[PDB]
Amino acid sequence: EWSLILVNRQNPIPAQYDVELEQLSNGERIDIRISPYLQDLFDAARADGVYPIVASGYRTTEKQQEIMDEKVAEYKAKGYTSAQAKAEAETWVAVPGTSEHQLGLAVDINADGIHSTGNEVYRWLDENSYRFGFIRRYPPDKTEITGVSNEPWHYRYVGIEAATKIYHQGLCLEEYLNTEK
């Protein structure tokens, strides 16, 4: 139940959401409940010659705002008005209160650069993350349901049972939760 919490534009983070955070060696933080699962995922990738890093875990409200504002600025520089930019940025960065990053349940995983390319990490994760309870949260073929663009770096902990079902039936989290009730 706990790891199946739905957070998106229609489901904000609950008001007094408690989370205990573990600090990784790079200073990023995650929900302490997902720690051994993320550790196992990283160990397994490295046993396969794939070297990922956690580019972003937990974010405070203000951090989310800033990430979003930066995405808005990028669209403004490419010829969007302020209003247009804000709407387009939402397809990539959630408004504060609606990011999975604010749960500590989501990590953006990149390649280390030296040993692996992005695409080798993204491919490995797509094919293996579910065995560690993580799903590719925003897949290209579910944008019409999730509201979010293809983000091959963004992985969400839901637990092994749910992740495996979601993987084999080719679902997004919203669809899985709908079919659970």
Q: How far is the CB of 63 from Cu ion (least distance, A)?
A: 12
* Rounded Cα distance, 113 and 156, in Å: 22
Q: Tokens for 178?
A: 């709908």
Which residues belong to the active site?
Answer: 151
Binding of Cu ion by 154 (CB under 5 A): yes
Return the number of the residue (49 or 140) whose C-beta is nearest Cu ion.
Answer: 140
Of 68, 141, 147, the C-alpha closest to 101 is 68
Q: Please give the distance of CA 127 from its chain centroid, rounded to a whole number.
A: 16
Q: Is 108 in the site for Cu ion (CB under 5 A)?
A: yes
Distance CA 175, CA 181 (A): 10
Please state the closest distance from residue 144 (CB atom) to Cu ion, in A. 19
DSSP for 110-138?
EE-SSS--HHHHHHHHHHHGGGGTEEESS
Q: Which residues does the annotation place in the binding site?
A: 64, 92-94, 99, 101, 108, 154
Cβ 181 to Cu ion shortest distance, Å: 26
Instruction: Answer for the pair 95, 12: CB distance below 8 angstroms, yes or no.
Output: no
**Per-residue contact track with Cu ion, 14 to 53, x per CB under 5 A?**
----------------------------------------
Nearest-angstrom CA–CA distance, 40 and 1: 22
Residue 45 or 67: which CB sits closer to Cu ion?
67
Closer of 82 and 149 to Cu ion (Cβ): 149
By CB under 5 A, is residue 59 in contact with Cu ion? no
Interacting residues toward Cu ion by CB under 5 A: 108, 154
